[PDB]
Design a protein around this nucleic acid. Structure first.
Length: 66
DNA sequence: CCTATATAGG
DNA sequence: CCTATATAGG
């Protein structure tokens, strides 16, 4: 399935897009929270590095709560 | 380095 | 209030 590779405390981490709870933009940074094994995890990626699915959840987050 | 940015999180 | 993320440079 689709995955997003992001940094976390100096290391590359990966998470399935299906686990993402909320995604939002901060300029060129795309931040998000995810269900992390029962607790909330966080991550962010550069907009250029975001996978399509994440950018769609983004557009549908704000470009779909207008 | 720092401050700011959006957001969530007992 | 603090922290974590990418980027700006206000």
């Amino acid at each position: 399935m689709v995955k997003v590779k992001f940094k976390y405390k100096g290391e590359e981490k990966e998470v399935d897009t299906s686990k993402i709870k909320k995604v939002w933009r901060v300029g060129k940074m795309v931040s998000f929270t995810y269900d992390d094994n029962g607790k909330t995890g966080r991550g962010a990626v550069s907009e250029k590095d975001a996978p399509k699915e994440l950018l769609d959840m983004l557009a549908r987050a704000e470009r779909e709560k207008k």
